[PDB]
Amino acid sequence: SYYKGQTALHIAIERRNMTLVTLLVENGADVQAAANGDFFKKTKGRPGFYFGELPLSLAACTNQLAIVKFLLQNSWQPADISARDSVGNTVLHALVEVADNTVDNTKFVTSMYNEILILGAKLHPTLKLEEITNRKGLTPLALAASSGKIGVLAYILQREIHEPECRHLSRKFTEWAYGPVHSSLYDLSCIDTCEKNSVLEVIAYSSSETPNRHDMLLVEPLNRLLQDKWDRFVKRIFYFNFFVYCLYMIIFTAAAYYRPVEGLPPYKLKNTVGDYFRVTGEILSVSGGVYFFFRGIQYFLQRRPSLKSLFVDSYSEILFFVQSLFMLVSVVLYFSQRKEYVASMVFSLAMGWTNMLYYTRGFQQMGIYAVMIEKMILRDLCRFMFVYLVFLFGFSTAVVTLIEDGKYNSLYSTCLELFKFTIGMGDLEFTENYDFKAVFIILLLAYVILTYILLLNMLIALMGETVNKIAQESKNIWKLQRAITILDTEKSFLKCMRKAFRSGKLLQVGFTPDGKDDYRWCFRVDEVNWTTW
Amino acid sequence: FSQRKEYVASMVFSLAMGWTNMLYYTRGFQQMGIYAVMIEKMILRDLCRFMFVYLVFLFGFSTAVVTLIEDGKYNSLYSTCLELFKFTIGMGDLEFTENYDFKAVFIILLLAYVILTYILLLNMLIALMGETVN
Amino acid sequence: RKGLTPLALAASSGKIGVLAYILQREIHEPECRHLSRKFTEWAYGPVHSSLYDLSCIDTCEKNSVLEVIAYSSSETPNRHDMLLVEPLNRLLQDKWDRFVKRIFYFNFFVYCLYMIIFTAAAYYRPVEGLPPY
Ligand code: NA
């Protein structure tokens, strides 16, 4: 089962013997044999070499150029290119999947890709390879984007061919040049809207374990495209949303500040303006709470993410949902003739007020500041509170055990007294009912020294990580966050209107191999070159 | 079992030390283990080199201040040492006694002590990060 | 006389280069393969699997390399950096992940339970005078 399915053609190909391969081919053996052995499986056991399951793919992925040309250019029985294996991957898909982000590997892969593509175009110009999809509905470009292959994506996006009868395979062109300045064009077909899955959509919604989510948006066209969309309309949409949220929060605060103090709600309103205003404010607050609840549940339903990504990703959708839950529980308690609705309301109010850092994205420096804040919260709280809590509990138990009786004979009181030392209110003489004063003093001094050493170690370790390798990541994270916001806003059409669109229609190549012309929704960029004439 | 009362002191020392003796199990977790390693290295490499100067300064200024005072509650050495130690944790008084002469000398001594101690703490935290060049 | 072989002597005195060379020695000549310690079971395309000899590394019945490196005194030059050699890191990771993890977790749980019991017992001591009670 492990070596099952192998055929002589595979050995001949993978031994680097051209003459033996030719002699074996002369016999007439089938060139469409597929090996289903477990040794060629995806990740079934660490050992294995996936190569597409076809002899043509084997030749392509093993540095074989003359051999693959011979296989594809024989008069006896040429091998079809549109072949698909059990998984459905083609030679192009296998080439994409073999890449592992190494400079030599990247140059090899791109050279082989270009050669095979031009040969395929030359032999059968009528057919197009890049639009063939496997079972998962992924094209080579989508597959490259999903798995974080920087080199292949970068090569494909700005591909340039400078040969007659092959211009129509290119994606980057040159509209005109004059002196030190020339303007280029980039093809946007299947980048922002493909009707199945675009590059931007795949990169934005990918799970966090993907290798290079942050750094994959630095490729040329994407940055400018996102900036254009933003500056056209996302700015106005975002500012309107921010204003509305601020107004709602102000109303909620003002309504909560004037609650009545009589006992056992509900309270019967009186014939005065203040009562009407207060009731209106409360109604508005409840409406906002239910709105946020429904939006959050809708998002959680559509995305359906995993568990480990619920805090690394969606770090804000959970907070808004929790605030809404607090509001609803407060309402339920209020209409049940109890008094804990006040506690629920204050928790909701504080959390909502602190939940306003979400809107700092859209401003560069503030966004970077917020990114650093959240990274530190998620990366240091757990690692630095454990030791402190251990020390506090141990010394508090010792001190409480020493005392005989009095007001400080509990555990809560002594824990609070020892916590006071960390914020600059230590007493050192907060009780006198005990024996062996020397033990008391020694314990307190040891606790103080250990805590201060611990704080010093925490601030040195915290700056150690920043070797200047903290800002370049923060900027990329902020850019990814803004990109997600732009995509979401575009998907949620403003009102019922629809004006957004990538760029203008244009004629660049003129004519395909067929007589008919074509249009490909380009996006012009102006650049000035002084050297390398 | 000898009908005494110091077993309480022994028991509390044992309890506190045992509770703090639990950092041994942080090995087996990568980041926590590295944190504990840094903690122990700092304890063994800075305590002796940084407490000597502070204790010297504290004792000298405490002896001077005690010698200045005439009589009262703060006419001992333990009391004045504790009062001057309070300054380091944010509870300085600057007027904790009034039974003496030559108030200017008292104020000058206290100000000099405060300035020297703060300079010393600053130097300690700069020297401590200097060693970490990554 | 001290019962040290060249490998043990190299490990004890902190000679990184000699130890690194000896551990992964490779000979590619006929009639001399049996002197090697690293081999090649098979190769296929861009992938090939190697083998490492573990005789007298983790159990020699007198003194192994791991035992000598672990218990060496602190004045030895390169105790910390001598475990970065190839086979040793993976060997230690394997042993850990097989069974030391479970042993360690059980020990941690037992210690926590004992400490909780001791704290609770000490918190409720009687206050009458002149023990025993
Ligand atoms: Na203070």
Residue numbers in the entry:
A (entry chain D): 197 to 603, 627 to 752
B (entry chain A): 531 to 603, 627 to 687
C (entry chain A): 331 to 463
Question: What did the published study say regarding this structure?
Answer:
The capsaicin- and heat-activated receptor, TRPV1, has served as a model for deciphering lipid modulation, which is relevant to understanding how pro-algesic agents enhance channel activity in the setting of inflammatory pain. Identification of a pocket within the TRPV1 transmembrane core has provided initial clues as to how phosphoinositide lipids bind to and regulate the channel. Here we show that this regulatory pocket in rat TRPV1 can accommodate diverse lipid species, including the inflammatory lipid lysophosphatidic acid, whose actions are determined by their specific modes of binding. We captured several states of TRPV1 ranging from channels in which the VBP is empty to those bearing different bioactive lipids, including distinct phosphoinositide species, brominated phosphoinositide analogs and a pro-algesic lipid, lysophosphatidic acid (LPA). Together, our data show how the VBP accommodates a range of bioactive lipids and how occupancy of the site corresponds to the structural status of the pore.
To determine the effect of the resident PI lipid on channel gating, we devised a protocol to eject this lipid and render the binding pocket empty. First, we used capsaicin to displace the resident lipid from detergent-solubilized channels. We then washed out the competing vanilloid followed by reconstitution of the channel into lipid nanodiscs of defined composition and devoid of phosphoinositide lipids. These samples were applied to grids held at 4 °C or 25 °C (temperatures at which TRPV1 is normally closed) and then taken forward for cryo-EM analysis. The final maps were refined using C4 symmetry and resolved to 2.9 Å and 3.7 Å for the 4 °C and 25 °C samples, respectively. In both cryo-EM structures the vanilloid pocket is, indeed, unoccupied by either a resident PI lipid or capsaicin. Interestingly, we observed that Y511 is flipped toward the binding pocket in these two structures, akin to what is seen in the agonist-bound state, demonstrating that reorientation of this fiducial side chain primarily reflects ejection of the resident lipid. We also see transition of a π-helical turn in S6 to an α-helical configuration (π–α transition), resulting in rotation of the lower half of the S6 helix by one residue. This π–α transition rotates the gating residue L679 away from the central axis with a narrowest restriction now formed by rotation of M682 into the pore. Indeed, consistent with our previous study6, the difference in the B factor of M682 compared to a nearby residue (A680) is 15.01 Å2 for data at 25 °C and 10.57 Å2 for data at 4 °C. This is substantially higher than the B factor difference in the apo state (~1 Å2), which shows that M682 is more dynamic in the α state, and thus suggesting that M682 is sufficiently malleable to pass ions in the α state.
